[PDB]
Write a protein that binds this ligand. Structure first.
Ligand SMILES: CC(C)(COP(=O)(O)OP(=O)(O)OC[C@H]1O[C@@H](n2cnc3c(N)ncnc32)[C@H](O)[C@@H]1OP(=O)(O)O)[C@@H](O)C(=O)NCCC(=O)NCCS
Ligand SMILES: CC(C)(COP(=O)(O)OP(=O)(O)OC[C@H]1O[C@@H](n2cnc3c(N)ncnc32)[C@H](O)[C@@H]1OP(=O)(O)O)[C@@H](O)C(=O)NCCC(=O)NCCS
Ligand SMILES: CC(C)(COP(=O)(O)OP(=O)(O)OC[C@H]1O[C@@H](n2cnc3c(N)ncnc32)[C@H](O)[C@@H]1OP(=O)(O)O)[C@@H](O)C(=O)NCCC(=O)NCCS
Lengths: 273, 157, 273, 184
């Protein structure tokens, strides 16, 4: 009653910019929820509103949805899908089982989208030729992130890469980082045929290409979103779909509690220390 | 080469340090003095990154930018002519000689008490060369009612 | 080498049905990844493949995407978005900050989609009239889940409800549980105008209506997916979008570490026990 | 049956060193569970077995337990205890509510134990005087981690600090990093 008629002031300890719900309508970054559905933006359209607070063009919205379908699942053998299945088989709920596998995502699992985007942009911004970038990273003892597949090499391409690369060439107005990464790929396939752009490295160089070449973002704004981890969220939101599907699969199959076999574990305990 | 009118109703200041209560006292002074703009345009704290600190323009919440480096504050705010130096006695000498490298600053307020007299004479000598008024050291600053007050001068509202 | 030429047999301790990745192509429940993109199913299309292993019709796929946009965010004041912002302001990564707020989802926050779907289906299957269902739940001392809004009552409807209800009436072939829940809503608006179908209760009764009335599912199959928590995953996948957007917002605003004020906490510690 | 009588070899994909349970007795890093309780080591004793795989001396074990009591809680206003209370009030279980607040621990909340240990050891190993360490960190624009309290300053000391510092001086054989940090 004292705050409403203005005798006191109390500092607001929180600041938000992505959603306003204290009104007649739900608002996604300045846009009402009816105008969200009237203008036929999809899940990639509201992802641009919630994560970037921007009206993205319809190719940029549809590219975001295509990134979520190719990162949706990659089988149960990966480290995150393993942990979801163990937590599902231990009788836990959907939220706990998702979480136990979603927290495996980080640097060695699921970090190659953000790592390759930072890697190729650093080489392209500090302008060096793709031949010098391959030689620079060889002498530092580091492999190029987003380069190299286990089985699909050349004349047998990765189909997830070929779906997304065909979309980016047709619809994006300019792809300078993609063209840089494809010349890096031309050099690395002269060493081994397997060293092609992954689906991790394709998404990384084309999401950066979507940010700084769609007109919605400035250069310092597009570099900030890569720096704070927008491509970490693209993998996490995509792979959360397959992890929930891995949870719902183990509940249907009614799999019991898992115990790892003792013969797969090497016990190298000390003598009496 | 010292000026006569040090402060006016368009005077902008950069405050060196985290004195959020002191800066809020200035913005409480400005709104009651019916100023158009706050006195404090930026704050300089060398121990944190560049961000924005939330303050009050009366009942309205505004953001004042905080800068790690002084050069980022002087470049982004060319209209600032006053520095209010809230550095300690062992750090006010290096902050005041660094802000005399910027010609926009015409008045420096040094709040710290305990600066050695040999170091203060070098502050007086270089301010005499650059034509820069120094109010201090060991002062609360000063107050010009209706226009501008320095830091904590005059107490609370 | 002994397993390849068949001298030994070793039991497989895991069973999966949603994704096959050990081939030339990534496969989403029997469908290759190129045919996924050729037939123009979206994120709701691959959600039906990963979570239900079914070809859903194009209205059922598009209804799933519309459910994810309306559950995408509901401001920072809710309990899960609060916990994401605290973990983001404490300098944690995207995965940890998502997780800290995603684990608030459960029974009191975000459980009303699954609770209302179980509540209305139990009344509709054990066939009683909507007037008897309202009187049954009153004498048990339980409020009807998915009924009742704080501010938007009647002649001022909830716009998220009106978007999704218009889609379900036009596109779904038969909605018996929706028509049951709308007659329950007609009775509860005779008590207070506020007691309308929420967006939680609309999604709950229409997702069940999507499962048993699209032709892909049998009745015991559609009842199993509600029982194992498919509507828990719909809220969690939707609200994970806004929580990542809440994380990316606090990194851009560069908000410092939060400490709750001591005057908002009531300390009622014992004397010396 | 083929693995038991040795016709095939299959590589073990996991390696562990802290606990052996496939025997007559539970073993904590080479020590059986009855000898753990016979020799009267406590929670700090089994922490040395599980985390370091070492027989620690009784002052080192008892110092570990004293560290766990002083870090046990610091009120509900901190960022992790806030998140546990929100998840508890949302009707979640013990495991989920612990977790939602435990995941706030990181760099800005709860990282000052590990940050100060790395900070003071780096200065002490690359041997500089404490006066030069204070001047080094001032010119880099960084505050010294593990230095500075909000209310308890001097002649009104922090009591958790005074309990643990009195234990370390009496019981530890040599404290060179503590004596470095006290001169800082
Ligand atoms: C020698 C041999 C075993 C190893 O070569 P290889 O398997 O082709 O290649 P490597 O594994 O060394 O890697 C090839 C290059 O790919 C690079 N590479 C691998 N992964 C990479 C990644 N992710 N990003 C970037 N570069 C990568 C490596 O750095 C290496 O670079 P370099 O050649 O400039 O050092 C192979 O050449 C061979 O089989 N030779 C034939 C043997 C023979 O001649 N015998 C004849 C008589 S019987
Ligand atoms: C000027 C004044 C406002 C600011 O000084 P202060 O609050 O004592 O000190 P600061 O906040 O600058 O910090 C003091 C030192 O502690 C250091 N410090 C702070 N936190 C630290 C940490 N965690 N680790 C290490 N060092 C730390 C700071 O770097 C600073 O170092 P420096 O002095 O070498 O730069 C204060 O001196 C004051 O009130 N002076 C009296 C005003 C006056 O004299 N008026 C008289 C006329 S009315
Ligand atoms: C008496 C009074 C205070 C309380 O009534 P109210 O706020 O309208 O309604 P309640 O909060 O009791 O709830 C109304 C019904 O909605 C039901 N309800 C509430 N939430 C529900 C939910 N989520 N699901 C289903 N039912 C729900 C309640 O069970 C209640 O049912 P019942 O009426 O069959 O018991 C109100 O009638 C009133 O203001 N009356 C006017 C006072 C007056 O007459 N004074 C005149 C002289 S000055």
């Amino acid at each position: 009653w004292a705050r409403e008629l203005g005798l006191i002031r109390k500092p607001a300890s929180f600041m938000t910019s992505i959603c306003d719900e204290r009104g007649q309508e739900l608002i996604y970054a300045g846009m009402p929820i009816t105008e969200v559905f009237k203008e036929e933006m999809g899940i990639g359209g509201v992802l641009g509103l919630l994560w970037f607070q921007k009206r993205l063009p319809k190719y940029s919205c549809q590219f975001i949805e295509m990134c979520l379908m190719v990162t949706a699942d990659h089988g149960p053998a990966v480290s995150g899908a393993h942990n979801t299945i163990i937590c599902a088989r231990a009788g836990k709920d959907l939220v706990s089982s998702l979480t136990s596998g979603l927290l495996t995502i980080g640097d060695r699992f699921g970090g190659a989208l953000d790592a390759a985007a930072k890697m190729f942009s650093k080489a392209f911004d500090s302008g060096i030729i793709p031949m010098e970038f391959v030689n620079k990273m060889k002498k530092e003892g580091k492999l190029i992130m987003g380069i190299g597949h286990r089985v699909k090499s050349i004349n047998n391409p990765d189909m997830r890469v070929q779906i997304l690369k065909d979309y980016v060439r047709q619809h994006f107005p300019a792809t300078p980082l993609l063209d840089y990464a494809l010349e890096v790929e031309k050099i690395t396939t002269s060493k081994k045929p397997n060293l092609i752009l992954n689906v991790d490295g394709l998404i990384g160089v084309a999401f950066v290409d979507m940010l700084r070449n769609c007109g919605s973002f400035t250069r310092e704004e597009a570099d900030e979103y890569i720096d704070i981890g927008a491509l970490n969220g693209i993998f996490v939101l995509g792979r959360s779909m397959g992890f929930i599907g891995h949870y719902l699969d183990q509940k249907r199959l009614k799999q019991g509690l898992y115990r790892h076999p003792w013969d797969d574990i090497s016990y190298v305990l000390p003598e009496h220390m | 080469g010292k000026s006569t009118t040090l402060f006016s109703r368009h005077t902008k200041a950069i405050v060196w340090g985290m004195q959020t209560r002191a800066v809020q006292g200035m913005l409480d002074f400005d709104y009651v003095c019916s100023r158009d703009e706050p006195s404090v345009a930026a704050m300089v704290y060398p121990f944190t990154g560049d961000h924005k600190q939330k303050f009050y323009w009366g009942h309205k919440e505004i953001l004042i930018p905080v800068f790690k480096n002084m050069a980022d504050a002087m470049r982004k705010h060319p209209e600032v002519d006053v520095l209010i130096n809230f550095a300690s006695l062992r750090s006010a000498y290096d902050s005041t000689m660094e802000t005399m490298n910027y010609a926009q600053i015409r008045t420096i307020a040094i709040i710290a008490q305990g600066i050695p007299e040999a170091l203060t004479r070098k502050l007086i000598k270089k301010a005499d060369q650059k034509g820069v008024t120094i109010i201090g050291p060991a002062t609360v600053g000063g107050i010009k009612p209706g226009c501008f007050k320095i830091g904590n001068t005059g107490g609370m509202l």
